[PDB]
Design a protein around this ligand. Structure first.
Ligand SMILES: Nc1ncnc2c1ncn2[C@@H]1O[C@H](COP(=O)(O)OP(=O)(O)OP(=O)(O)O)[C@@H](O)[C@H]1O
Ligand SMILES: Nc1ncnc2c1ncn2[C@@H]1O[C@H](COP(=O)(O)OP(=O)(O)OP(=O)(O)O)[C@@H](O)[C@H]1O
Ligand SMILES: Nc1ncnc2c1ncn2[C@@H]1O[C@H](COP(=O)(O)OP(=O)(O)O)[C@@H](O)[C@H]1O
Ligand SMILES: [Mg+2]
Lengths: 219, 440, 352, 50, 278
């Protein structure tokens, strides 16, 4: 399955080439590195610590976790009412963190052709793994994480199926301990239990409609 | 998973002391408690030692009922380890060897069989105990029951039991089956043994047992060639061949039976192989018999009975006779059989030559009146032995098959082709001789 | 060494490839019909010094490019996809780490391991050993962990796939992947196929549906007929894994394809204690740790949740900036993870 | 369709009997089988509805 | 140059090593089904002086439709073991291929190879992969499947009633097939393979336990009597799990308890409707 270059007529392999990823996957990669410091978010002071400790701390000081003899958490999900500060925190984390970021959107992994969303997910996790430790940010995770159900209407099965593939990628055979995941949803009441499970999306963080002190801080 | 070795080792001496003192109940109860604790702990060795201790103590109590009951309860103890049960059973087997009381023996053996029915971890012992019980029911003059009890054991299946015991068990089965006077089951049981096994390291007594049981089996209805084969194998056995009498009797039987055999390709090859036996010289008259049965020329029954009549049937002090032609009913049957084989060889020999032979002259030469010779020929033809057409109306016996013109011309062609090849060969020899004598 | 590599490269430059194609029939002593992989069929010769008894109707063969002369035979192809399906790495989980499953692991080993060493028992009783077993149960219980333990401990080969990664866009390609996988297994006996999330392709075959639905159903018919079809499968074992056994084709649950339906449910009190002990071992701890208290505050949890109790316990311990896990941090962890459980929808599905 | 099937069935039964002709007894048996399978299909549909 | 009749790629059963190993005696019961499948692929092969005396046109193929596990692929396997004619086996999921014109090409190649060998049987297992009634002829893929299906019909209709090439196909859902297959001239027999009834349950138990050690204690009449709709494949898992327990406890005999546990294992009873009905 490697990628090599061959002579046009003698068909003799002549050089090794960089692996191929679907252009759609490659576009998901961050290049601009947004610039939003941890001062720009006020009123979410517990949540910010939770997520920073979960995602960034392991990457820098892994010695602490090795000393305590604990595997660090796997995954973080952010849920709160619309406009409560979800994507802004992740953008800030990308601004300060240095590992490879990958963006995404729930609706970006749904493709018309059967078997294309799974290939997108698999190649994205592969690029994240290959390019040193990294984080994936699946915004609008509710697009693909919907509960499964028994219905005679087709179409939804394909999204469910790429969802199964994402589930398996997070925590499944061949454990992955170099990539971490983030997500954001306005509705957590419709996400699959196998995705809120305590092994794939471990730390779940709530974002409340800001309180008086938070409103003054934001303004 | 949790050791109990120290507890059991400490306790057991006290338990034995108390039992021998007369505290059987307390010691048995404490042993049961330790067994339950260990088994819940899953300690195979401690449980085995405790179980053997109990079985030993109870036996030196004349508590046959108590011993048997305790064997039952130990066997059905829940989560009971298989190794512990096996050790208890081997102890019980030794003991069954020891005890002597007929009712006590029978009851203990039955209990051992019931606890020993259907389990790999104790599977040898079941066969051994069944063999013992078959023995006991046998020397009580009951044979059918012995045959059934023995046949109920499928020795081959057991993958752990060693080979020699397997073969001995099978051989006991076969002897019992022959005793019961049933044979089809014997044929069924014979194939199960492997004849190749009797070559490996020491199978000498078992080999002779097998071959004698067959020879007794094949004599029932008449399979003379198979019996010759088995006697031959016995003769090839080093023990028989080492002593003079043993191998000499082996050869006597082998030659007489190859003689008695029905003529066919196999019997012909066998007789040819046996004939070239340098050791055969020791048995003069018997090698005479062999040659007479391999030479192609009519032989008179009268001459054979006059010369070898006494050396075969009545025996010789110098040369021991064989049961082949003794005074038993089977002796008369096999004597008739030898008559038959001389007559059939006579018929065949005149059936190679003798295109046509008047019925009277065949009957005179075969030493039978017209009718019996005609019946013998008719049976031979109906059985496909030989081909011939009796023209009862003219008294002629034609030995010639039809000659379709196709075959006639084909024979003509073969003759021409042979002529051509001989012409070529004579020319080659001529060239050789001219080369050897002409250059000079 | 530089010149040796240079001359090796220069010699290597002058050499040509052989078209790989399959022999379809041997017409005469020196005539073979070969179907090159692209599709064009040729009638071609054969090199004189080659065992022509090994070119049966189906052998793969390397054809020279100019004359198309058969020149070498090869063993059956192993697609790169199957190379990856066969070279996974289930860490090194041992049966110890699996806590709280004893009956289930026994049944699993009975199904797949015993017939691979001790067939004589099955011959003595007189039965053919079962082929495959479904692992069904609430999420986070240990299905995949059991499969990884079976893969690492056992000695036969392994094949691991996600049913959601078999499917492919072009019509008639997923079925070909399944068929070729089972052929590969049929070659390297013994082998175990672990279909993960067979609910991704095992779904009731409807009367009414759409084109993609029909394509996946074709894939499923292929699998079904590979398991127990015209060709007896013999010595390759199977295990599946689903959180939705109910949404499966009745023809796939039939007890000739999936012989055993093992349930892997949520841990019970003693099992909870076992898992807690297994996960809490490698921690660096101070003071007494009364696992009865956590077993009591962890109703409804699953193995992952108790692992998370340990992880969160250490997270709290660092949050305080100590260097140990004390009991109180365990209590905080358990109560927290109890708080987060309100989001998961607790219910189980059965195969009916 | 039932009355079309009864004809072919009866002919085939007569053929098994090894004859050139169909018999009234053969027709009775064929119609019994065809109607039994028809009622079986009807009750199977009813059970599926249930 | 003109080659032998077929180069082909649909290899035909070697009937030498690939012949299956299910005798007619491995099956138990299904006497009526054995008759029809044999009577439909042998009775036209013998005689034929009696099959146009009564005017009934000879059968072309056989459809074998039944619940999921009642012996559909067993009988085909047996008739492939015993029969002398050449055998070609396929699965409908195999005809469907990537490139256009390849499905039709495979169908034509198969039927042509069958026609080359006068006595021949073609088995297409899981015909549901092709002959589905409902279609959506707007995506191409469904168009190619319809193309394969139409090619099958056209090849089936292309016979002269004087070539001994027979076709048998098995489906778990006859109703989902398109009617174009069922029309006379094409597939002319449907053979139900229903779940076993008492007598068949008894026969299959005896025939599957016939290879057991099965101490005399077990009374199978008890297990057969039970009013439980069980498919033949299950009746083999009961008999298999019984010996499995036997081996677990390290025996080589099967007791009544072992069988009871097997039957309670394989036949889990549905969720008892709360008894405030009835
Ligand atoms: N606590 C906060 N501190 C600073 N800015 C905030 C805060 N809460 C909301 N905002 C502002 O909200 C605006 C839009 O919110 P944003 O899209 O980042 O949130 P969200 O929760 O991810 O929303 P959505 O559900 O639409 O993805 C951002 O410009 C950010 O400036
Ligand atoms: N009468 C029978 N005697 C013995 N075994 C039987 C019988 N009927 C069914 N079986 C069992 O059927 C199993 C195989 O089932 P089979 O392949 O025939 O299923 P099927 O009906 O074709 O299934 P599907 O509809 O899913 O294709 C074998 O294990 C065999 O034990
Ligand atoms: N019995 C158990 N012992 C230890 N860990 C467990 C157990 N059950 C689940 N886990 C945890 O759950 C994860 C394994 O998930 P698994 O149960 O194999 O798949 P699924 O998501 O299908 O339940 C691992 O991180 C493991 O630590
Ligand atoms: Mg957002």
């Amino acid at each position: 399955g490697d990628l090599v270059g061959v002579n046009k007529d003698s068909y003799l392999i002549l050089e090794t080439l960089p692996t191929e990823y679907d252009s759609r996957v490659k576009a998901m990669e961050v290049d601009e590195r947004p610039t939003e410091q941890y001062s720009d978010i006020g009123g979410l002071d517990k949540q910010i610590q939770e997520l920073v400790e979960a995602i960034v701390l392991p990457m820098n000081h892994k010695e602490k976790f090795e000393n305590l003899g604990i595997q660090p958490p796997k995954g973080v999900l952010m849920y709160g009412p619309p406009g409560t500060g979800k994507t802004l925190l992740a953008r800030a984390c990308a601004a300060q963190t240095k590992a490879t970021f990958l963006k995404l959107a729930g609706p970006q992994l749904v493709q018309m052709f059967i078997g294309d969303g799974a290939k997108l997910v698999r190649d994205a996790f592969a690029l994240a793994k290959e390019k040193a430790p990294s984080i994936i940010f699946i915004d609008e995770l509710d697009a693909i994480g919907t509960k499964r159900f028994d219905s005679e209407k087709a179409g939804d099965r394909e999204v469910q199926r790429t969802m199964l593939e994402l589930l398996n990628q997070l925590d499944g055979f061949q454990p992955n301990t170099q990539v971490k995941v983030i997500a954001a949803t306005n509705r957590v009441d419709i996400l699959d239990p196998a995705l809120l499970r305590s092994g794939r999306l471990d730390r779940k963080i709530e974002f409340p409609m800001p309180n008086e002190e938070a409103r003054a801080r934001i303004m | 998973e949790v050791d109990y070795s120290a507890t059991v080792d400490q306790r057991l001496p006290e338990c034995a002391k108390l039992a021998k003192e007369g505290r059987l109940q307390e010691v048995i109860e404490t042993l049961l408690s330790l067994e339950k604790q260990t088994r819940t702990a899953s300690d195979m060795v401690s449980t085995s030692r405790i179980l053997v201790a109990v079985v030993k103590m109870c036996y030196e109590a004349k508590e046959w009922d108590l011993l048997n009951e305790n064997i039952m309860l130990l066997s059905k103890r829940r989560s009971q380890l298989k190794q512990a049960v096996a050790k208890m059973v081997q102890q019980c087997c030794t003991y069954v060897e020891e005890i002597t009381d007929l009712p006590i023996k029978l009851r203990l053996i039955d209990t051992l069989r019931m606890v020993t029915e259907g389990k790999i971890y104790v599977e040898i012992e079941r066969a051994r105990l069944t063999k013992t019980l078959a023995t006991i029911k046998e020397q009580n003059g009951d044979v059918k029951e012995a045959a059934s009890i023995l046949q109920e054991l499928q020795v081959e299946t057991y993958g752990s039991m060693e080979k020699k015991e397997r073969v001995e068990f099978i051989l006991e089965q076969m002897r019992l089956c022959l005793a019961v006077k049933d044979y089809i089951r014997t044929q069924i049981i014979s194939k199960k043994i492997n004849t190749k096994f009797f070559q490996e390291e020491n199978t000498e007594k078992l080999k002779l047992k097998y071959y004698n049981l067959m020879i007794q089996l094949d004599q029932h209805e008449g399979s003379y060639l198979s019996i010759c084969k088995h006697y031959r194998a016995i003769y090839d056995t080093p023990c028989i061949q080492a002593e003079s009498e043993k191998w000499q009797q082996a050869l006597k039987s082998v030659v007489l039976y190859v003689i008695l055999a029905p003529f066919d390709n196999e019997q012909s090859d066998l007789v040819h192989r046996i004939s070239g036996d340098k050791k055969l010289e020791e048995i003069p008259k018997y090698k005479d018999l062999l040659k007479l049965f391999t030479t192609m020329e009519l032989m008179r029954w009268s001459t054979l009975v006059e010369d070898y009549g006494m050396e075969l049937r009545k025996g010789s002090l110098e040369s021991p006779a064989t049961d082949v032609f003794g005074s038993t009913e089977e002796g008369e049957k096999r004597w008739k059989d030898l008559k038959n084989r001389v007559v059939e060889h006579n018929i065949r020999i005149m059936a190679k030559y003798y295109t046509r032979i008047t019925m009277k002259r065949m009957a005179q030469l075969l030493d039978l009146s017209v009718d019996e010779s005609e019946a013998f020929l008719s049976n031979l033809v109906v059985n496909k032995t030989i081909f011939a057409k009796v023209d009862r109306l003219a008294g002629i016996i034609n030995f010639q098959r039809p000659k379709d013109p196709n075959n006639l011309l084909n024979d003509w062609s073969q003759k021409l082709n042979s002529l051509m090849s001989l012409v070529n060969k004579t020319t080659h020899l001529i060239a050789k001789e001219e080369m050897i004598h002409n250059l000079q | 060494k530089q010149y040796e590599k240079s001359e090796n490269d220069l010699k290597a430059l002058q050499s040509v490839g052989q078209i790989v194609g399959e022999v379809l029939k041997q017409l005469t002593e020196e005539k073979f019909i070969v179907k090159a992989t692209n599709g064009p069929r040729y009638v071609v010769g054969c090199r004189r010094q080659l065992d022509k008894s090994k070119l049966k109707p189906g052998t793969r063969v390397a054809l020279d490019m100019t004359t198309l002369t058969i020149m070498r035979y090869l063993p059956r192809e192993v697609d790169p996809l199957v190379y990856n399906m066969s070279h996974e790495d289930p860490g090194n989980v041992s049966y110890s780490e699996i806590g709280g499953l004893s009956e289930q692991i026994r049944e699993l080993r009975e199904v797949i391991e015993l017939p691979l060493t001790n067939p004589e028992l099955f011959q003595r009783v007189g039965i053919i050993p079962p082929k495959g077993c479904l692992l069904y149960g609430p999420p986070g219980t240990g299905k995949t962990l059991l499969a990884r333990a079976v893969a690492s401990q056992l000695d036969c080969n392994f094949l691991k796939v996600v049913s959601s990664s078999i499917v492919d866009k072009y019509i008639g390609e997923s079925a070909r992947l399944i068929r070729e996988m089972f052929n590969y297994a049929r070659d390297h006996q013994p082998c175990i196929i672990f279909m993960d999330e067979i609910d991704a392709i095992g779904g009731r075959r409807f009367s009414e549906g759409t084109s993609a639905d029909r394509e996946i159903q074709r894939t499923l018919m292929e699998l079904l007929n590979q398991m127990d079809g015209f060709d007896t499968l013999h010595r390759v074992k199977m295990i599946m894994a689903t959180n939705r056994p109910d949404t499966l084709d009745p023809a796939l649950l039939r007890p000739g394809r999936l012989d055993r339906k093992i349930h892997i449910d949520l841990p019970n009190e003693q099992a909870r204690l076992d898992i807690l002990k297994i996960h809490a071992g490698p921690i660096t701890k101070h003071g007494e740790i009364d696992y009865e208290a956590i077993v009591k505050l962890s109703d409804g949890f699953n193995g992952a949740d108790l692992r998370n109790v340990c992880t969160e316990a250490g997270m709290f311990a660092i949050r305080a900036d100590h260097d140990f896990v004390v009991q109180e941090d365990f209590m905080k962890a358990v109560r927290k993870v109890a708080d987060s459980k309100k989001l998961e929808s607790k219910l189980d599905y059965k195969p009916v | 369709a039932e009355v079309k099937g009864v004809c072919t069935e009866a002919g085939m039964y007569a053929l098994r009997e090894r004859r050139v002709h169909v018999t009234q007894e053969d027709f009775e048996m064929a119609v019994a089988k065809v109607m039994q399978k028809d009622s079986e299909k009807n009750m199977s549909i009813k059970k599926l509805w249930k | 140059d003109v080659l032998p009749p077929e180069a082909d790629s649909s290899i035909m059963m070697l009937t030498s090593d690939q012949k299956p190993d299910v005798m007619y005696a491995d099956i138990g019961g299904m006497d009526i089904q054995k008759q029809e499948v044999r009577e439909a692929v042998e009775l036209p092969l013998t005689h034929f002086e009696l099959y146009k005396q009564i005017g009934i046109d000879p059968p072309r193929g056989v459809l074998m439709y039944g619940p999921p596990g009642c012996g559909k692929t067993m009988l085909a396997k047996a008739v492939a073991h015993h029969t002398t004619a050449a055998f070609i086996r396929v699965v409908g999921s195999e005809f469907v291929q990537k490139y256009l014109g390849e499905g039709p090409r495979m169908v034509r190649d198969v039927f042509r190879l069958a026609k080359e060998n006068a006595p021949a049987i073609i088995f297409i297992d899981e015909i549901d992969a092709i002959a589905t009634k409902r279609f959506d002829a707007q995506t191409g893929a469904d168009r190619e499947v319809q193309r394969i299906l139409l090619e099958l019909l056209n090849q089936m209709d292309g016979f002269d009633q004087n070539v001994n090439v027979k076709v048998i196909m098995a489906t778990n859902r006859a109703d989902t097939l398109d009617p174009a297959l069922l029309r006379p001239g094409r597939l002319d027999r449907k053979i139900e393979f229903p779940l076993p009834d008492r007598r068949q349950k008894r026969l299959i138990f005896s025939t599957i336990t016939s290879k057991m050690n099965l101490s005399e204690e077990v009374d199978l009449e008890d297990y057969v009597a039970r009013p439980d709709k069980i498919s033949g494949a299950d009746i083999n898992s009961i008999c298999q799990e019984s010996g499995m327990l036997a081996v677990r406890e390290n025996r080589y005999i099967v007791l009544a308890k072992d069988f009871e546990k097997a039957y309670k294992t394989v036949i889990k009873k549905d969720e008892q409707e709360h008894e405030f009905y009835k």
